[PDB]
Amino acid sequence: DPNRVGLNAATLDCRGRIYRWLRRGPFFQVDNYFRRSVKLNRDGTLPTDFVHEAPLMRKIIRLAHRGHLKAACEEYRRVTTVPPVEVYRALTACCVPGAKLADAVSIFEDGDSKLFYVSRD
RNA sequence: UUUAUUCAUAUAAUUAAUAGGAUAAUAUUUGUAGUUUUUGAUACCAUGAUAAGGAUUAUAAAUUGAAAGUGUUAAUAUCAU
């Protein structure tokens, strides 16, 4: 659904909404923007299949297959959707020939518990 | 003669209520439950400030340093069920 990508926001009109805005947690904007966004679908598959974020994943996999770990990490910072499993496979396989264990463990732990277990592969 | 404030005459602004999200043994969920929502009692109480007069202690040349406590009359005045 490429047409219905987007989220509407509020206006903070009444006094109780102002009091709720002043009583909100430390992560209220990013949490509600993340949970109002992509989530596990009705049949159980991942929300990976995103149209607008599709060529960024191709660029990340293309840069992690040529050995460019830092550029793939830099365009991994630009992701909004849950990235596919092939991103984590390409990133970890880029981490193998340099023996970079800490970067591979961080790559796994980023998608392990935070991103619906996409790196648990 | 110009300007900081003051004053004149033109103005915009209006309402109400909560909602927990990774590493948690399974609820998909949140424009939903609210409508005739709250901002509505400045009074005649007997307050309190002002001025004025009293007494006690120093018999040491030491110490950085011989300084501190206790009582009465006039006028003015008193807007909270």
PDB file of C-alpha atoms (C1' of nucleotides) in Angstrom:
ATOM      1  CA  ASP A   1       0.000   0.000   0.000  1.00  0.00           C
ATOM      2  CA  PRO A   2       2.149   2.891  -1.257  1.00  0.00           C
ATOM      3  CA  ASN A   3      -0.649   5.469  -1.224  1.00  0.00           C
ATOM      4  CA  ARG A   4      -1.624   5.168   2.457  1.00  0.00           C
ATOM      5  CA  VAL A   5       1.900   5.571   3.869  1.00  0.00           C
ATOM      6  CA  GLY A   6       1.780   8.364   6.433  1.00  0.00           C
ATOM      7  CA  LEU A   7       0.643   9.185   9.948  1.00  0.00           C
ATOM      8  CA  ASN A   8      -1.652  11.930  11.209  1.00  0.00           C
ATOM      9  CA  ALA A   9      -0.947  13.831  14.419  1.00  0.00           C
ATOM     10  CA  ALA A  10      -2.895  15.773  17.038  1.00  0.00           C
ATOM     11  CA  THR A  11      -3.254  19.446  18.003  1.00  0.00           C
ATOM     12  CA  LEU A  12      -3.285  19.443  21.881  1.00  0.00           C
ATOM     13  CA  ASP A  13      -6.515  21.390  22.299  1.00  0.00           C
ATOM     14  CA  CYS A  14      -8.090  20.885  25.720  1.00  0.00           C
ATOM     15  CA  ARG A  15      -6.423  21.339  29.109  1.00  0.00           C
ATOM     16  CA  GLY A  16      -6.417  17.605  29.847  1.00  0.00           C
ATOM     17  CA  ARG A  17      -4.490  16.949  26.641  1.00  0.00           C
ATOM     18  CA  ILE A  18      -1.910  19.544  27.737  1.00  0.00           C
ATOM     19  CA  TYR A  19      -1.660  17.806  31.120  1.00  0.00           C
ATOM     20  CA  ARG A  20      -1.221  14.460  29.350  1.00  0.00           C
ATOM     21  CA  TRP A  21       1.483  16.014  27.157  1.00  0.00           C
ATOM     22  CA  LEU A  22       3.272  17.268  30.273  1.00  0.00           C
ATOM     23  CA  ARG A  23       2.887  13.855  31.964  1.00  0.00           C
ATOM     24  CA  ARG A  24       4.173  11.827  29.013  1.00  0.00           C
ATOM     25  CA  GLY A  25       7.133   9.493  29.262  1.00  0.00           C
ATOM     26  CA  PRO A  26      10.666  10.065  28.028  1.00  0.00           C
ATOM     27  CA  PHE A  27       9.949   8.243  24.747  1.00  0.00           C
ATOM     28  CA  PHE A  28       6.377   9.169  23.811  1.00  0.00           C
ATOM     29  CA  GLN A  29       6.773  10.669  20.342  1.00  0.00           C
ATOM     30  CA  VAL A  30       9.127   8.018  18.954  1.00  0.00           C
ATOM     31  CA  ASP A  31       7.249   5.177  20.695  1.00  0.00           C
ATOM     32  CA  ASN A  32       3.821   6.124  19.366  1.00  0.00           C
ATOM     33  CA  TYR A  33       5.287   6.911  15.945  1.00  0.00           C
ATOM     34  CA  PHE A  34       6.934   3.473  15.936  1.00  0.00           C
ATOM     35  CA  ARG A  35       3.887   1.509  17.116  1.00  0.00           C
ATOM     36  CA  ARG A  36       1.410   3.450  14.967  1.00  0.00           C
ATOM     37  CA  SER A  37       3.798   2.475  12.153  1.00  0.00           C
ATOM     38  CA  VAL A  38       4.850  -1.042  11.061  1.00  0.00           C
ATOM     39  CA  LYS A  39       3.874  -4.078  13.134  1.00  0.00           C
ATOM     40  CA  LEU A  40       3.364  -7.812  12.744  1.00  0.00           C
ATOM     41  CA  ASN A  41       0.704  -8.554  10.141  1.00  0.00           C
ATOM     42  CA  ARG A  42      -2.522 -10.523  10.505  1.00  0.00           C
ATOM     43  CA  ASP A  43      -1.179 -13.797   9.090  1.00  0.00           C
ATOM     44  CA  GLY A  44       2.094 -13.572  11.028  1.00  0.00           C
ATOM     45  CA  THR A  45       4.594 -12.307   8.474  1.00  0.00           C
ATOM     46  CA  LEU A  46       6.990  -9.433   9.031  1.00  0.00           C
ATOM     47  CA  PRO A  47       6.258  -5.813   7.998  1.00  0.00           C
ATOM     48  CA  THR A  48       9.473  -5.971   5.935  1.00  0.00           C
ATOM     49  CA  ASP A  49       7.796  -5.596   2.526  1.00  0.00           C
ATOM     50  CA  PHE A  50       7.820  -1.802   2.155  1.00  0.00           C
ATOM     51  CA  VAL A  51       7.611  -0.138  -1.248  1.00  0.00           C
ATOM     52  CA  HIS A  52       9.155   3.255  -0.483  1.00  0.00           C
ATOM     53  CA  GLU A  53      12.064   1.837   1.544  1.00  0.00           C
ATOM     54  CA  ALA A  54      12.800  -0.927  -0.979  1.00  0.00           C
ATOM     55  CA  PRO A  55      15.845   0.483  -2.898  1.00  0.00           C
ATOM     56  CA  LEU A  56      17.576   1.477   0.350  1.00  0.00           C
ATOM     57  CA  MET A  57      17.675  -2.206   1.335  1.00  0.00           C
ATOM     58  CA  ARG A  58      19.107  -3.027  -2.097  1.00  0.00           C
ATOM     59  CA  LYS A  59      21.784  -0.364  -1.583  1.00  0.00           C
ATOM     60  CA  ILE A  60      22.607  -1.722   1.891  1.00  0.00           C
ATOM     61  CA  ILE A  61      22.883  -5.319   0.637  1.00  0.00           C
ATOM     62  CA  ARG A  62      24.904  -4.131  -2.371  1.00  0.00           C
ATOM     63  CA  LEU A  63      27.323  -2.224  -0.125  1.00  0.00           C
ATOM     64  CA  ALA A  64      27.639  -5.033   2.435  1.00  0.00           C
ATOM     65  CA  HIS A  65      28.448  -7.557  -0.300  1.00  0.00           C
ATOM     66  CA  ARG A  66      31.311  -5.454  -1.699  1.00  0.00           C
ATOM     67  CA  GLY A  67      32.970  -5.163   1.722  1.00  0.00           C
ATOM     68  CA  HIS A  68      31.859  -1.608   2.576  1.00  0.00           C
ATOM     69  CA  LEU A  69      30.812  -2.066   6.195  1.00  0.00           C
ATOM     70  CA  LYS A  70      30.860   1.599   7.232  1.00  0.00           C
ATOM     71  CA  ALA A  71      28.742   2.862   4.326  1.00  0.00           C
ATOM     72  CA  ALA A  72      26.254   0.037   4.885  1.00  0.00           C
ATOM     73  CA  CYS A  73      26.132   1.007   8.559  1.00  0.00           C
ATOM     74  CA  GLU A  74      25.613   4.659   7.598  1.00  0.00           C
ATOM     75  CA  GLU A  75      22.669   3.924   5.316  1.00  0.00           C
ATOM     76  CA  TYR A  76      21.391   1.488   7.932  1.00  0.00           C
ATOM     77  CA  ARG A  77      20.951   4.563  10.137  1.00  0.00           C
ATOM     78  CA  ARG A  78      18.503   6.008   7.578  1.00  0.00           C
ATOM     79  CA  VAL A  79      15.992   3.135   7.787  1.00  0.00           C
ATOM     80  CA  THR A  80      12.436   3.774   8.997  1.00  0.00           C
ATOM     81  CA  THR A  81      10.793   0.388   8.338  1.00  0.00           C
ATOM     82  CA  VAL A  82      11.898  -2.979   9.754  1.00  0.00           C
ATOM     83  CA  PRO A  83      14.776  -4.089   7.477  1.00  0.00           C
ATOM     84  CA  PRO A  84      14.759  -7.550   5.856  1.00  0.00           C
ATOM     85  CA  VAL A  85      16.712 -10.570   7.029  1.00  0.00           C
ATOM     86  CA  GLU A  86      18.967 -10.277   3.960  1.00  0.00           C
ATOM     87  CA  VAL A  87      20.272  -6.958   5.339  1.00  0.00           C
ATOM     88  CA  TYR A  88      21.404  -8.702   8.525  1.00  0.00           C
ATOM     89  CA  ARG A  89      22.835 -11.626   6.544  1.00  0.00           C
ATOM     90  CA  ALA A  90      24.831  -9.301   4.276  1.00  0.00           C
ATOM     91  CA  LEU A  91      26.006  -7.136   7.195  1.00  0.00           C
ATOM     92  CA  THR A  92      27.151 -10.101   9.284  1.00  0.00           C
ATOM     93  CA  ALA A  93      28.818 -11.720   6.256  1.00  0.00           C
ATOM     94  CA  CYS A  94      30.633  -8.419   5.773  1.00  0.00           C
ATOM     95  CA  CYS A  95      31.680  -8.653   9.425  1.00  0.00           C
ATOM     96  CA  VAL A  96      33.156 -12.177   8.979  1.00  0.00           C
ATOM     97  CA  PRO A  97      36.367 -11.614   6.898  1.00  0.00           C
ATOM     98  CA  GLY A  98      37.590  -8.753   9.095  1.00  0.00           C
ATOM     99  CA  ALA A  99      36.970 -10.739  12.327  1.00  0.00           C
ATOM    100  CA  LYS A 100      34.828  -7.862  13.636  1.00  0.00           C
ATOM    101  CA  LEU A 101      32.865  -9.694  16.316  1.00  0.00           C
ATOM    102  CA  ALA A 102      31.515  -6.676  18.225  1.00  0.00           C
ATOM    103  CA  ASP A 103      29.966  -5.101  15.123  1.00  0.00           C
ATOM    104  CA  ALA A 104      28.316  -8.412  14.204  1.00  0.00           C
ATOM    105  CA  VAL A 105      26.964  -8.889  17.738  1.00  0.00           C
ATOM    106  CA  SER A 106      25.596  -5.327  17.662  1.00  0.00           C
ATOM    107  CA  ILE A 107      24.046  -5.976  14.227  1.00  0.00           C
ATOM    108  CA  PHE A 108      22.338  -9.084  15.601  1.00  0.00           C
ATOM    109  CA  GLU A 109      21.206  -7.428  18.842  1.00  0.00           C
ATOM    110  CA  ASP A 110      19.745  -4.422  17.007  1.00  0.00           C
ATOM    111  CA  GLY A 111      17.178  -6.582  15.236  1.00  0.00           C
ATOM    112  CA  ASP A 112      17.042  -9.376  17.824  1.00  0.00           C
ATOM    113  CA  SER A 113      14.667  -8.115  20.500  1.00  0.00           C
ATOM    114  CA  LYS A 114      13.851  -4.640  19.188  1.00  0.00           C
ATOM    115  CA  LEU A 115      12.723  -5.387  15.623  1.00  0.00           C
ATOM    116  CA  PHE A 116      10.424  -8.446  15.916  1.00  0.00           C
ATOM    117  CA  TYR A 117      13.272 -11.019  15.751  1.00  0.00           C
ATOM    118  CA  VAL A 118      14.407 -10.461  12.176  1.00  0.00           C
ATOM    119  CA  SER A 119      18.063 -11.237  12.924  1.00  0.00           C
ATOM    120  CA  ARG A 120      17.161 -14.457  14.764  1.00  0.00           C
ATOM    121  CA  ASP A 121      17.980 -16.457  11.651  1.00  0.00           C
TER     122      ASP A 121
ATOM    123  C1'   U B   1      12.706  69.968  19.634  1.00  0.00           C
ATOM    124  C1'   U B   2      13.313  63.515  19.793  1.00  0.00           C
ATOM    125  C1'   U B   3      12.402  59.800  23.334  1.00  0.00           C
ATOM    126  C1'   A B   4      11.257  55.175  28.822  1.00  0.00           C
ATOM    127  C1'   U B   5       6.491  55.199  31.393  1.00  0.00           C
ATOM    128  C1'   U B   6       1.628  57.580  31.786  1.00  0.00           C
ATOM    129  C1'   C B   7      -2.902  58.805  28.896  1.00  0.00           C
ATOM    130  C1'   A B   8      -6.606  58.791  24.258  1.00  0.00           C
ATOM    131  C1'   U B   9      -8.983  56.202  20.377  1.00  0.00           C
ATOM    132  C1'   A B  10      -8.868  51.578  17.223  1.00  0.00           C
ATOM    133  C1'   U B  11      -8.853  45.305  19.778  1.00  0.00           C
ATOM    134  C1'   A B  12      -7.449  40.373  19.286  1.00  0.00           C
ATOM    135  C1'   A B  13      -8.120  36.030  22.482  1.00  0.00           C
ATOM    136  C1'   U B  14     -12.885  31.935  24.607  1.00  0.00           C
ATOM    137  C1'   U B  15     -13.735  26.814  27.622  1.00  0.00           C
ATOM    138  C1'   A B  16     -14.447  21.058  29.381  1.00  0.00           C
ATOM    139  C1'   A B  17     -11.703  13.754  30.621  1.00  0.00           C
ATOM    140  C1'   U B  18      -8.514   9.143  31.078  1.00  0.00           C
ATOM    141  C1'   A B  19      -5.761   5.705  28.111  1.00  0.00           C
ATOM    142  C1'   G B  20       0.116   1.346  30.110  1.00  0.00           C
ATOM    143  C1'   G B  21       3.977  -0.913  23.357  1.00  0.00           C
ATOM    144  C1'   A B  22      11.420  -4.625  22.810  1.00  0.00           C
ATOM    145  C1'   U B  23      14.372  -8.416  25.860  1.00  0.00           C
ATOM    146  C1'   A B  24       6.857  -9.993  30.009  1.00  0.00           C
ATOM    147  C1'   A B  25       3.353 -17.713  28.499  1.00  0.00           C
ATOM    148  C1'   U B  26      -0.308 -15.224  23.579  1.00  0.00           C
ATOM    149  C1'   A B  27      -7.104 -10.018  24.647  1.00  0.00           C
ATOM    150  C1'   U B  28      -5.035  -5.878  17.870  1.00  0.00           C
ATOM    151  C1'   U B  29      -7.414  -1.111  20.925  1.00  0.00           C
ATOM    152  C1'   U B  30      -8.357   3.013  21.421  1.00  0.00           C
ATOM    153  C1'   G B  31     -11.549  10.190  17.310  1.00  0.00           C
ATOM    154  C1'   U B  32     -13.855   5.035  22.793  1.00  0.00           C
ATOM    155  C1'   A B  33     -16.844   5.741  26.981  1.00  0.00           C
ATOM    156  C1'   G B  34     -18.751  13.305  28.043  1.00  0.00           C
ATOM    157  C1'   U B  35     -22.876  16.569  27.766  1.00  0.00           C
ATOM    158  C1'   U B  36     -28.227  21.120  30.094  1.00  0.00           C
ATOM    159  C1'   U B  37     -19.512  20.410  31.715  1.00  0.00           C
ATOM    160  C1'   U B  38     -16.200  24.381  36.023  1.00  0.00           C
ATOM    161  C1'   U B  39     -14.400  29.522  35.831  1.00  0.00           C
ATOM    162  C1'   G B  40     -20.365  33.155  40.563  1.00  0.00           C
ATOM    163  C1'   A B  41     -21.439  35.585  47.577  1.00  0.00           C
ATOM    164  C1'   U B  42     -15.908  42.308  48.308  1.00  0.00           C
ATOM    165  C1'   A B  43     -18.770  43.374  53.324  1.00  0.00           C
ATOM    166  C1'   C B  44     -18.958  48.846  57.804  1.00  0.00           C
ATOM    167  C1'   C B  45     -16.855  43.489  64.164  1.00  0.00           C
ATOM    168  C1'   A B  46     -14.182  44.505  68.894  1.00  0.00           C
ATOM    169  C1'   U B  47      -7.519  45.097  64.080  1.00  0.00           C
ATOM    170  C1'   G B  48      -2.951  47.646  64.170  1.00  0.00           C
ATOM    171  C1'   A B  49       0.639  51.405  63.498  1.00  0.00           C
ATOM    172  C1'   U B  50       2.528  56.850  66.022  1.00  0.00           C
ATOM    173  C1'   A B  51       4.707  59.826  69.886  1.00  0.00           C
ATOM    174  C1'   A B  52       5.895  60.233  75.017  1.00  0.00           C
ATOM    175  C1'   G B  53       7.994  59.375  79.885  1.00  0.00           C
ATOM    176  C1'   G B  54      11.039  54.294  84.211  1.00  0.00           C
ATOM    177  C1'   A B  55      14.487  51.689  86.934  1.00  0.00           C
ATOM    178  C1'   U B  56      19.326  47.709  87.320  1.00  0.00           C
ATOM    179  C1'   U B  57      24.809  46.602  86.584  1.00  0.00           C
ATOM    180  C1'   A B  58      30.211  48.701  86.404  1.00  0.00           C
ATOM    181  C1'   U B  59      35.229  49.761  93.157  1.00  0.00           C
ATOM    182  C1'   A B  60      38.607  44.927  87.719  1.00  0.00           C
ATOM    183  C1'   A B  61      44.332  47.271  84.102  1.00  0.00           C
ATOM    184  C1'   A B  62      42.838  41.376  82.772  1.00  0.00           C
ATOM    185  C1'   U B  63      40.635  40.012  78.119  1.00  0.00           C
ATOM    186  C1'   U B  64      40.200  39.578  70.632  1.00  0.00           C
ATOM    187  C1'   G B  65      36.294  41.821  73.123  1.00  0.00           C
ATOM    188  C1'   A B  66      33.984  45.336  80.753  1.00  0.00           C
ATOM    189  C1'   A B  67      27.858  45.499  77.629  1.00  0.00           C
ATOM    190  C1'   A B  68      23.039  43.802  78.292  1.00  0.00           C
ATOM    191  C1'   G B  69      18.151  42.369  79.688  1.00  0.00           C
ATOM    192  C1'   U B  70      12.962  44.247  82.474  1.00  0.00           C
ATOM    193  C1'   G B  71       7.430  48.524  83.324  1.00  0.00           C
ATOM    194  C1'   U B  72       3.058  53.227  82.133  1.00  0.00           C
ATOM    195  C1'   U B  73      -0.391  57.562  79.104  1.00  0.00           C
ATOM    196  C1'   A B  74      -2.541  60.837  74.955  1.00  0.00           C
ATOM    197  C1'   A B  75      -4.247  61.330  69.661  1.00  0.00           C
ATOM    198  C1'   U B  76      -5.245  58.398  64.874  1.00  0.00           C
ATOM    199  C1'   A B  77      -7.649  53.934  63.245  1.00  0.00           C
ATOM    200  C1'   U B  78     -10.785  49.202  62.876  1.00  0.00           C
ATOM    201  C1'   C B  79     -15.778  47.100  55.675  1.00  0.00           C
ATOM    202  C1'   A B  80     -14.284  39.159  55.919  1.00  0.00           C
ATOM    203  C1'   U B  81     -20.943  34.171  56.986  1.00  0.00           C
TER     204        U B  81
END
